[PDB]
Amino acid sequence: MRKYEVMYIIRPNIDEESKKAVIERFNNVLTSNGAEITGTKDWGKRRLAYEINDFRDGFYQIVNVQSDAAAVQEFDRLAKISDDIIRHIVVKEEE
Amino acid sequence: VMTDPIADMLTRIRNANMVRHEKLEIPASKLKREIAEILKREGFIRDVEFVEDSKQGIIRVFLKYGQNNERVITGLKRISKPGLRVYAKSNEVPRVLNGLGIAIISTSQGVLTDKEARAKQAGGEVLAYVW
Amino acid sequence: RAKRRKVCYFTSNGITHIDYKDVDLLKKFVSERGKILPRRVTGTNAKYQRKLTAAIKRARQMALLPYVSGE
Amino acid sequence: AIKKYKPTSNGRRGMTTSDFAEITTDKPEKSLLAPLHKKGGRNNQGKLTVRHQGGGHKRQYRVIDFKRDKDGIPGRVATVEYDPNRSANIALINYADGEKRYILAPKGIQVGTEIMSGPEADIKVGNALPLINIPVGTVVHNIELKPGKGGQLVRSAGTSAQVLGKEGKYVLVRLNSGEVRMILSACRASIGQVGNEQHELINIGKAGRSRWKGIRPTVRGSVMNPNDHPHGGGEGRAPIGRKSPMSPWGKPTLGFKTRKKKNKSDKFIVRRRKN
Amino acid sequence: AITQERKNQLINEFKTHESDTGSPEVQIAILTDSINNLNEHLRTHKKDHHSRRGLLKMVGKRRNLLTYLRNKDVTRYRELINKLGLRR
RNA sequence: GGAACUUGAGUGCAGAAGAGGAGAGUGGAAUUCCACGUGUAGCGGUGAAAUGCGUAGAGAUGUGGAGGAACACCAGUGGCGAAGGCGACUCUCUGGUCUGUAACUGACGCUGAGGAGCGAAAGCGUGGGGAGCGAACAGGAUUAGAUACCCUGGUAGUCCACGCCGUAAACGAUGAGUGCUAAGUGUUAGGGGGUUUCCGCCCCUUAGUGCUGCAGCUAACGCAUUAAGCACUCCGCCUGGGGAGU
């Protein structure tokens, strides 16, 4: 087991309820993977120097979890299936 | 890789002659201290003194130097070497550099100078020549 | 002989940063040309500059900083 | 894998066969077996519309619902079986209903893996869900042209297809050899390219294996008598002197388009002939 | 990796002493575990030529250490290779 | 051969960084093509030109889409790796190196014919890919001739996957290991200390690596604690040129 920090972007235009749906979904997946919570923060809306698909800005969101080591391998594709999410990255925590 | 401590001590004393430092250190062995005592008898070197530290070592050798500059020894070489055994019958031993030079020949009676070896009529391995 | 102008100013108030979570200091590292400043100005040791390099690349992955802009 | 044969005989010198590693059980389930009388390529009138057909080994059809009309019901891959009828291997799948239906088998499937036929099903291989829910660029197989008709597209082994993107009407698709069509968005399709890609690499190695296929030999056209074939006649290996290489039927074959210039499918052809 | 707990378990089982951190026993044991993991790693990818030559070097190490162990105490050696099941 | 020792060596503990290897995913810029908008006689190329592209509306510009290849700037006689060689990012597995009190093993070391593996680029076999670049080749120029240097194109190749081939100025034209031998001035990562909480200055000690130079070596050029210096151990190799690496 090891620590992990993860960032991901959700769509700026999304309705707050649907945002609650995708966040409870990402949390249910994150706990399905056995990734224990350590801490989290909400960067929220921020302007972008460049668009990814088209959007001029995005909702940043981050999590910090103690976990495998096996889970990220399943978490990535499940982070790929959703059209609502834009980008996701999982960096190891070794400050 | 430390193939032979004695030849190493010989390149130590030769390099020491080249650098003209007053003294240098060598790891201990009775084989080394005996021939060093032989050089002490020959007088080419001023003094040798061991200093104990666990386990082996460390001898400190003081090079002698002439009153009018000049290296005390004009040459030094170890004819004996691993991968090429050498032997010498008691009458067969050369008198290197004629009368000035002396052989260092280990024998059954112990390490001996070519004069003492000729007197004892005892042959043995020729460790090195110094001149 | 010898001293560099505008050297470091990081180890003096470091260290272990960031690795990339901050945006303000990375905004300090970026040039008007949008590229990382040379060690001749930044003053950092090459290891710190390279860890900083991979860190800012991670920031570009975070899209926290521009990849390219006007000069 | 491919098991090369040692040249113990002249027919052994080139012949090769597939590993059959995917196969699990020696025999098909009795319930879904169907008869296959061999027409031999003859018309119902009795005349042979198609040249050099028939004379092959006897075959027995296994029922296969490409349509996958049921949905929301999880399945399970119990076994995989050889299919004489086509290059693609068949993999039996047990539904939670207790229903059993042979189904087309994409490579990399494992025994006992769950498979849902519903819209809510996961992208994971063996699943079949409607194109609207399909993410762009994922490989897809057994695509239907219309819902409820079955997936005529991409049934042969080793073939694949990809989505270039989609609108409400219609979803784009990359058909094999690069051709593209706006297939209906409502229409169902199955993710994951068909397995047995090694079938193309198989070498027959003798005239005798062809008889079992059974691919009957085709006489070269120049050898044929002039009354029977346009390229016939001449005093031994006649040059294709006559203008425009030709079929025994009057239409030219080399580079001559056989397409109807006016067709209902012409509107759907966003792209054609990439070569 | 191997994980640190597995090392602590692997060492204590084979020590001739309460604090025998060294010894050809424990050395050839830890190197054996490294050989097994690296061998499985070679099985995962045949393209790992560097892991392969490194494995050859570690085989040189095990061969030299077991050779000297044959040179010293044959009884401890046969008991050890019987314990591990290795060596021809 | 018996009995011992830790300094050679190995292992451990506590740390240190590295384009090290392989697998998977992902990134943005640009070239090119396609689609449309805009707008019109040039565009492109050379020493000069012409071939070539363009009123069937190019080039240019705006937007969108597609595909492949490479990773700018960071980047540094920087780093890693045995060599060859490795330069976007993330993750997965994993090799190697260095430092430090110091625990343990107590010579368990070095080299190494045969043998085995790796091994640039080009090439060959099979299946894919092919944006650009580009042998062969086509055309236009240059010239007495131009089977070239130049330009406009362009196949194989260059790319991937599974194999073969095992050649390079594969060079540092300097084999590997170890000991010793003035120094100096940087850097690459560590360790200790002498004031200072720190910052930071100073001194010392390891290993990597750049240059300048004392002794010493030299046909000369030069080398020079990274010897080609003084010594040791082992392997490879040389015996006039051409004929002939035939």
Which residues are CB-contacts of D152 (< 8 A; sequence separation ≥ 6)?
D144, D145
Report the Cα B64 to chain-centroid distance in Å: 14
Which residues are CB-contacts of C14 (< 8 A; sequence separation ≥ 6)?
none
Asked if D123 is an interface residue toward chain A (Cβ–Cβ < 8 A), one would say: yes
Instruction: Provide φ and ψ at D93, rounded to 5°.
Output: -135, 125
Residue E44 burial by Cβ neighbours in a 10 Å radius (0-12, 13-18, 19+): exposed
Q: Where are the beta strands (DSSP E) in chain D?
A: 2-4, 16-18, 33-34, 61-62, 74-81, 90-95, 100-104, 114-116, 128-130, 140-141, 171-174, 180-183, 188-191, 269-271
Asked if A7 is an interface residue toward chain C (Cβ–Cβ < 8 A), one would say: yes
Helices and strands in chain C, H and E counts: 3, 0
Residue in A7, A94, A95 closest to C62 by CB: A7
Alpha-carbon distance D240 to D223, whole Å?
12
Q: Residue A69, SS3?
A: coil
Chain F, protein-covered positions (CB within 7 A): 5-8, 10-13, 17-23, 25, 27-29, 64-67, 72-76, 78, 81-83, 87-96, 103-105, 107-110, 112, 117-119, 126-128, 162-163, 177-182, 186-190, 199-201, 215-216, 229-234
Alpha-carbon distance A28 to A6, whole Å?
15
Going by the DSSP 8-state scheme, the letter that residue B81 receives in this structure is B
The closest of A2, A9, A91, A88 to A48, measured between CA atoms, is A9
The answer to whether D154 touches D192, Cβ cutoff 8 Å, is: no
The residue written with tokens 């060598």 in the block is B26
**B33 sits in which H/E element:** helix B30-42
Paired tokens of E88: 């021809």
CA of E49 to C1' of F246 (A): 38
Paired tokens of D162: 């990809």
Q: Which residues of C sit within 8 Å Cβ distance of A?
A: 16, 18-21, 58, 61-63, 65-67, 69
Nucleotide nearest to B53 (CA to C1'): F7
Which residues are CB-contacts of B116 (< 8 A; sequence separation ≥ 6)?
none
Residue in A48, A60, A91 closest to C58 by CB: A91
The size of chain B, in residues, is 131
β B102-107/B110-113 pair status:
antiparallel
Chain A residues close to C63, C-beta within 8 Å: 48-50, 52, 58, 87
Q: Which of A50, A62, A86 to substitute to test the interface with C, most C CBs within 10 Å?
A: A50
Interchain pair C63, A7: CB under 8 A: no
Asked if A87 is an interface residue toward chain C (Cβ–Cβ < 8 A), one would say: yes
Nucleotide nearest to C7 (CA to C1'): F200
- A 55-84 residues inside an 8 A Cβ radius of C: 58, 60
Instruction: Provide φ and ψ at E10, rounded to 5°.
Output: -65, -30
Chain C residues close to A7, C-beta within 8 Å: 62
Alpha-carbon distance A79 to A33, whole Å?
13
Chain D residues close to A83, C-beta within 8 Å: 135
Asked if D135 is an interface residue toward chain A (Cβ–Cβ < 8 A), one would say: yes
Interchain pair A50, C67: CB under 8 A: yes
**Which residues in E67-78 are b (16+ Cβ under 10 Å) and which e?**
eebeeeeeeebe
Q: Where are the beta strands (DSSP E) in chain B?
A: 23-26, 45-50, 59-63, 76-77, 102-107, 110-113, 126-130
Q: Report helix, strand and coil shares of chain A as percent, to nearest 5.
A: 25, 40, 30
Chain D residues close to A81, C-beta within 8 Å: 123, 135
| Identity of residue A23 | I
| Technique used | cryo-EM
Chains D, A in contact, 3 or more Cβ pairs below 8 Å: yes
CA dihedral for E59, E65, E70, E71, sign (positive or negative): positive
DSSP assignment string, D20-79: -TT---SS--GGGEE-----TTB-TTSSBSSSS--------EEPB-TT----S-EEEEEE
**Which residues in B67-95 are b (16+ Cβ under 10 Å) and which e?**
eeeeeebeeeebebeeeeeeebeeeebee
Q: Which of A55, A56, A91 to substitute to test the interface with C, most C CBs within 10 Å?
A: A91
Paired tokens of E20: 């025998």
β A85-92/A2-10 pair status:
antiparallel
Alpha-carbon distance B77 to B131, whole Å?
9
Chain A residues close to C65, C-beta within 8 Å: 49
3-state secondary structure A13-47: CCCHHHHHHHHHHHHHHHHHCCCEEEEEEEEEEEE
Paired tokens of D48: 């042979």
- How far is the alpha carbon of C66 from chain A, nearest alpha carbon, in Å? 5
Alpha-carbon distance E61 to E68, whole Å?
11
Paired tokens of A53: 């698909």
Alpha-carbon distance D257 to D259, whole Å?
6
Strand partners, D103: D91
Asked if A91 is an interface residue toward chain C (Cβ–Cβ < 8 A), one would say: yes
CA dihedral for D19, D22, D27, D30, sign (positive or negative): negative
Alpha-carbon distance D244 to D256, whole Å?
10
The answer to whether B74 touches B47, Cβ cutoff 8 Å, is: no
Nucleotide nearest to A70 (CA to C1'): F92
Chain A residues close to D135, C-beta within 8 Å: 80-81, 83
Cα atoms found within 13 Å of the Cα of residue C25, Cβ hemisphere only: 15
Alpha-carbon distance D248 to A4, whole Å?
71
The answer to whether D34 touches D80, Cβ cutoff 8 Å, is: no
Alpha-carbon distance C58 to D13, whole Å?
58
| Identity of residue B114 | D
The closest of A63, A64, A46 to A55, measured between CA atoms, is A46
The residue written with tokens 């044991």 in the block is E29
